[PDB]
Design an enzyme around this catalytic site. Structure first.
Site, PDB file in Angstrom:
ATOM      1  N   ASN A  35     -47.329  16.727  -2.213  1.00  5.22           N
ATOM      2  CA  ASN A  35     -47.036  16.564  -3.282  1.00  5.22           C
ATOM      3  C   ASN A  35     -48.378  17.340  -3.185  1.00  5.22           C
ATOM      4  O   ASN A  35     -49.669  17.862  -3.925  1.00  5.22           O
ATOM      5  CB  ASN A  35     -47.744  16.145  -4.642  1.00  5.22           C
ATOM      6  N   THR A  36     -49.853  17.351  -2.400  1.00  2.00           N
ATOM      7  CA  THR A  36     -50.929  17.934  -1.819  1.00  2.00           C
ATOM      8  C   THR A  36     -50.465  18.987  -0.410  1.00  2.00           C
ATOM      9  O   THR A  36     -51.027  18.643   0.909  1.00  2.00           O
ATOM     10  CB  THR A  36     -52.236  16.910  -2.269  1.00  2.00           C
ATOM     11  N   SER A  56     -48.617  11.985   1.234  1.00  2.00           N
ATOM     12  CA  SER A  56     -48.136  12.158  -0.469  1.00  2.00           C
ATOM     13  C   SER A  56     -47.276  13.712   0.148  1.00  2.00           C
ATOM     14  O   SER A  56     -48.059  14.466   1.123  1.00  2.00           O
ATOM     15  CB  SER A  56     -49.016  13.141  -1.135  1.00  2.00           C
ATOM     16  N   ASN A  99     -53.745   7.304   2.474  1.00  5.38           N
ATOM     17  CA  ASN A  99     -52.790   8.303   2.030  1.00  5.38           C
ATOM     18  C   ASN A  99     -52.241   9.941   2.890  1.00  5.38           C
ATOM     19  O   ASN A  99     -53.062   9.897   2.398  1.00  5.38           O
ATOM     20  CB  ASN A  99     -52.561   8.145   0.707  1.00  5.38           C
ATOM     21  N   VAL A 100     -52.196   9.535   3.613  1.00  6.73           N
ATOM     22  CA  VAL A 100     -52.243  10.718   4.623  1.00  6.73           C
ATOM     23  C   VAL A 100     -50.117  11.913   4.454  1.00  6.73           C
ATOM     24  O   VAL A 100     -49.625  12.207   4.708  1.00  6.73           O
ATOM     25  CB  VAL A 100     -52.364  10.567   5.328  1.00  6.73           C
ATOM     26  N   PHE A 146     -52.108  14.177  -7.318  1.00  6.37           N
ATOM     27  CA  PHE A 146     -53.439  13.057  -7.407  1.00  6.37           C
ATOM     28  C   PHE A 146     -54.455  13.779  -8.402  1.00  6.37           C
ATOM     29  O   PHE A 146     -54.730  13.590  -8.415  1.00  6.37           O
ATOM     30  CB  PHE A 146     -54.317  13.863  -6.106  1.00  6.37           C
ATOM     31  N   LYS A 149     -50.994   5.228   5.628  1.00  5.62           N
ATOM     32  CA  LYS A 149     -49.840   5.172   4.715  1.00  5.62           C
ATOM     33  C   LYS A 149     -48.854   6.773   5.419  1.00  5.62           C
ATOM     34  O   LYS A 149     -49.116   7.140   5.360  1.00  5.62           O
ATOM     35  CB  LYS A 149     -49.616   4.852   3.433  1.00  5.62           C
ATOM     36  N   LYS A 182     -52.508   3.582 -11.012  1.00  3.77           N
ATOM     37  CA  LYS A 182     -53.142   5.593 -10.502  1.00  3.77           C
ATOM     38  C   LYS A 182     -54.873   4.533 -10.345  1.00  3.77           C
ATOM     39  O   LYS A 182     -55.615   5.237  -9.045  1.00  3.77           O
ATOM     40  CB  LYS A 182     -53.255   6.804 -10.243  1.00  3.77           C
ATOM     41  N   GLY A 204     -49.171   4.317  -7.265  1.00  3.00           N
ATOM     42  CA  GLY A 204     -48.996   5.366  -8.031  1.00  3.00           C
ATOM     43  C   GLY A 204     -48.274   5.025  -9.203  1.00  3.00           C
ATOM     44  O   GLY A 204     -48.709   5.718 -10.930  1.00  3.00           O
ATOM     45  N   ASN A 256     -41.150  13.080  -8.595  1.00  7.01           N
ATOM     46  CA  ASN A 256     -42.680  13.578  -9.012  1.00  7.01           C
ATOM     47  C   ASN A 256     -42.828  14.360  -7.865  1.00  7.01           C
ATOM     48  O   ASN A 256     -43.346  14.293  -6.825  1.00  7.01           O
ATOM     49  CB  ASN A 256     -43.198  12.351  -8.772  1.00  7.01           C
ATOM     50  N   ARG A 257     -44.069  15.000  -8.842  1.00  6.82           N
ATOM     51  CA  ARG A 257     -45.157  16.073  -8.085  1.00  6.82           C
ATOM     52  C   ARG A 257     -46.344  15.718  -8.910  1.00  6.82           C
ATOM     53  O   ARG A 257     -47.180  17.235  -9.329  1.00  6.82           O
ATOM     54  CB  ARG A 257     -44.728  17.314  -7.945  1.00  6.82           C
ATOM     55  N   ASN A 304     -43.886   6.253   2.269  1.00  7.69           N
ATOM     56  CA  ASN A 304     -44.095   7.135   0.761  1.00  7.69           C
ATOM     57  C   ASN A 304     -42.668   7.902   0.622  1.00  7.69           C
ATOM     58  O   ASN A 304     -41.635   7.521   1.541  1.00  7.69           O
ATOM     59  CB  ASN A 304     -45.213   8.139   0.803  1.00  7.69           C
ATOM     60  N   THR A 305     -42.732   8.421  -0.122  1.00  9.91           N
ATOM     61  CA  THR A 305     -41.880   9.606  -0.642  1.00  9.91           C
ATOM     62  C   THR A 305     -41.079  10.555   0.361  1.00  9.91           C
ATOM     63  O   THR A 305     -41.762  10.669   0.857  1.00  9.91           O
ATOM     64  CB  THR A 305     -41.774   9.671  -2.140  1.00  9.91           C
TER      65      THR A 305
HETATM   66  C1  LIG Z   1     -44.176   8.134 -10.455  1.00  8.34           C
HETATM   67  C2  LIG Z   1     -44.529   8.140  -9.044  1.00  8.34           C
HETATM   68  C3  LIG Z   1     -46.120   8.676  -7.739  1.00  8.34           C
HETATM   69  C4  LIG Z   1     -46.276   8.258  -6.576  1.00  8.34           C
HETATM   70  N1  LIG Z   1     -47.500   8.306  -6.862  1.00  8.34           N
HETATM   71  C5  LIG Z   1     -48.014   7.869  -5.528  1.00  8.34           C
HETATM   72  C6  LIG Z   1     -49.730   7.839  -4.819  1.00  8.34           C
HETATM   73  O1  LIG Z   1     -50.493   8.266  -6.050  1.00  8.34           O
HETATM   74  N2  LIG Z   1     -50.008   7.785  -4.039  1.00  8.34           N
HETATM   75  C7  LIG Z   1     -49.014   6.674  -3.098  1.00  8.34           C
HETATM   76  O2  LIG Z   1     -49.808   6.457  -1.841  1.00  8.34           O
HETATM   77  N3  LIG Z   1     -47.791   6.539  -3.333  1.00  8.34           N
HETATM   78  C8  LIG Z   1     -47.561   6.953  -4.696  1.00  8.34           C
HETATM   79  N4  LIG Z   1     -45.860   6.821  -4.796  1.00  8.34           N
HETATM   80  C9  LIG Z   1     -45.415   6.282  -3.463  1.00  8.34           C
HETATM   81  C10 LIG Z   1     -44.259   4.726  -3.605  1.00  8.34           C
HETATM   82  O3  LIG Z   1     -45.563   4.250  -3.856  1.00  8.34           O
HETATM   83  C11 LIG Z   1     -43.765   4.497  -3.240  1.00  8.34           C
HETATM   84  O4  LIG Z   1     -44.307   5.106  -0.851  1.00  8.34           O
HETATM   85  C12 LIG Z   1     -42.550   5.192  -3.197  1.00  8.34           C
HETATM   86  O5  LIG Z   1     -42.880   5.822  -4.489  1.00  8.34           O
HETATM   87  C13 LIG Z   1     -41.106   4.481  -2.784  1.00  8.34           C
HETATM   88  O6  LIG Z   1     -41.237   3.504  -3.098  1.00  8.34           O
HETATM   89  P1  LIG Z   1     -40.391   2.657  -4.936  1.00  8.34           P
HETATM   90  O7  LIG Z   1     -39.157   3.897  -4.335  1.00  8.34           O
HETATM   91  O8  LIG Z   1     -40.003   1.860  -4.728  1.00  8.34           O
HETATM   92  O9  LIG Z   1     -39.945   3.698  -6.029  1.00  8.34           O
HETATM   93  C14 LIG Z   1     -45.319   7.695  -5.849  1.00  8.34           C
HETATM   94  C15 LIG Z   1     -44.646   7.244  -6.529  1.00  8.34           C
HETATM   95  C16 LIG Z   1     -43.557   7.650  -8.080  1.00  8.34           C
HETATM   96  C17 LIG Z   1     -42.436   7.208  -7.821  1.00  8.34           C
HETATM   97  O1  LIG Z   2     -47.906  13.416  -6.292  1.00  4.51           O
HETATM   98  C1  LIG Z   2     -48.437  12.555  -6.354  1.00  4.51           C
HETATM   99  O2  LIG Z   2     -49.744  12.056  -6.455  1.00  4.51           O
HETATM  100  C2  LIG Z   2     -48.119  11.446  -5.444  1.00  4.51           C
HETATM  101  C3  LIG Z   2     -46.996  11.795  -5.860  1.00  4.51           C
HETATM  102  C4  LIG Z   2     -46.087  10.932  -4.027  1.00  4.51           C
HETATM  103  O3  LIG Z   2     -44.545  10.528  -4.312  1.00  4.51           O
HETATM  104  N1  LIG Z   2     -46.050  10.305  -3.108  1.00  4.51           N
HETATM  105  C5  LIG Z   2     -47.861  10.463  -3.182  1.00  4.51           C
HETATM  106  O4  LIG Z   2     -48.604   9.749  -2.047  1.00  4.51           O
HETATM  107  N2  LIG Z   2     -49.103  11.049  -4.011  1.00  4.51           N
END
Ligand SMILES: Cc1cc2nc3c(=O)[nH]c(=O)nc-3n(C[C@H](O)[C@H](O)[C@H](O)COP(=O)(O)O)c2cc1C
Ligand SMILES: O=C(O)c1cc(=O)[nH]c(=O)[nH]1
Ligand SMILES: COc1ccccc1-c1ccc(NC(=O)/C(C#N)=C(/C)O)c(Cl)c1
Length: 361
Positions: A182-183, A180, A177-178, A114, A220, A65, A62, A110-111, A249-250
């Protein structure tokens, strides 16, 4: 590179001058330009996934990217870098604003959806430094590539398979990555039968690559899964010989007690309020896979104690992202120094000995 100055002055000022997406874009630029100012002790080294990791603290997906800042992230002190998620075709992601800070909670929502330069672009970018990455990897600094799927694709599995074919040869590990939030429909790929079919295809594609270009494959997962979903994942991962899990993930949950004005924004919540929910998910997945499947623990890590909790719960490696947005680069050395002090204080000979330790008391 003093924690206090970044924490008390620089970050708050930055946060008052820019919106969150702009601040993230400038941080990628800065990092990639190498405008960046801890020597890792041996106790931090970990061997997993067919690699040596000079320290167990990685940058979560994230932040970078599109594979732009990989070298400046190793220079920040990360023991391993994961880029992505990358989708097969370029796509813009959701309209802005799509990133929100919750400073009273040390959280972000965040949203992005991808937003991705796409596989071809990231492929050429990584090829331009491929031999340099080979030497970093051999030196204990591996590279993960996280794969997503396009918004309007009609065959999710073929999107991941394409990711495997194009970026698998450039990665030490790939992440399916299954999870997110936000998809639309993506997280239903975590279901047992979808998952088994998807991952069978991914692994056949990975196993078709030449041996020196053949990455480990991890899945993930979300922190929001039912107990049944977690059981089904564990079973699929063992049946297929998946190499590891990234947890988590989040969260689409909004824990009681969030104070930020933006807490009811749609998107994934990251940062401190996600921390123990992620730790508990690691703990469960580690037990359901009998400690035999490496886990990379991620969610709310902002200190040595946070890292060690996830390692004792079953993580072989951890990542962070959100903490960097509040504390800036010095948080990386902070987490490693505190983690090293705690491993000594608790009697462990190094990170390895602590992995999964809570399950053996
Ligand atoms: C701004 C943002 C964008 C993210 N984009 C992705 C992503 O593209 N793919 C993914 O697998 N996780 C993504 N994540 C999730 C982070 O990889 C992580 O799984 C999650 O934020 C928890 O870790 P943290 O609390 O240290 O941020 C994103 C997180 C944030 C904050
Ligand atoms: O919106 C994204 O691209 C994204 C956010 C997130 O928190 N996790 C993720 O896997 N993709
Ligand atoms: C290379 O990054 C920095 C270097 C010095 C000082 C600050 C930063 C910095 C500044 C901003 C960010 N990112 C954000 O603030 C952010 C938000 N909100 C996100 C989503 O990356 C990050 Cl990750 C790091």
């Amino acid at each position: 590179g003093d924690e206090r100055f970044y924490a008390e002055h620089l970050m708050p000022t930055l946060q008052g001058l820019l919106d969150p997406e702009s601040a993230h874009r400038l941080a990628v630029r800065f990092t990639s330009l190498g405008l960046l100012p801890f020597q890792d002790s041996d106790m931090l080294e970990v061997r997993v996934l067919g690699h040596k990791f000079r320290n167990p603290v990685g940058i979560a997906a994230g932040f970078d990217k599109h594979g732009e800042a990989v070298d400046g992230l190793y220079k920040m002190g990360f023991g391993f870098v994961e880029i992505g998620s990358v989708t097969p075709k370029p796509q813009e992601g959701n309209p802005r604003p799509r990133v929100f800070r919750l400073p009273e909670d040390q959280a972000v929502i965040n949203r992005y959806g991808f937003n991705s330069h796409g596989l071809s672009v990231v492929e050429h970018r990584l090829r331009a430094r491929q031999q340099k990455q080979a030497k970093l990897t051999e030196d204990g600094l591996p590279l993960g590539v996280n794969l997503g799927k396009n918004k309007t694709s009609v065959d999710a599995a073929e999107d991941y398979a394409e990711g495997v074919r194009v970026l698998g040869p450039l990665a030490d590990y790939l992440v399916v990555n299954v999870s997110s939030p936000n998809t639309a429909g993506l997280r239903s790929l975590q279901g047992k039968a979808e998952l088994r079919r998807l991952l069978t295809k991914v692994l056949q594609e990975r196993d078709g690559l030449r041996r020196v270009h053949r990455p480990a494959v991890l899945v993930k997962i979300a922190p929001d899964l039912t107990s049944q979903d977690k059981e089904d994942i564990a079973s699929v991962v063992k049946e297929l010989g998946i190499d590891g899990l990234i947890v988590t993930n989040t969260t689409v949950s909004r824990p009681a007690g969030l104070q930020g004005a933006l807490r009811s924004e749609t998107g994934g919540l990251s940062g401190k309020p996600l921390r123990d929910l992620s730790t508990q998910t690691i703990r469960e997945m580690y037990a359901l896979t009998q400690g035999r499947v490496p886990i990379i623990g991620v969610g709310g890590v902002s200190s040595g104690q946070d890292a060690l909790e996830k390692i004792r719960a079953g993580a072989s490696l951890v990542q962070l992202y959100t903490a960097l947005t509040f504390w800036g680069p010095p948080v990386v050395g902070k987490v490693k120094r505190e983690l090293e002090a705690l491993l000594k204080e608790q009697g462990f000979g190094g990170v390895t000995d602590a992995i999964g330790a809570d399950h053996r008391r």
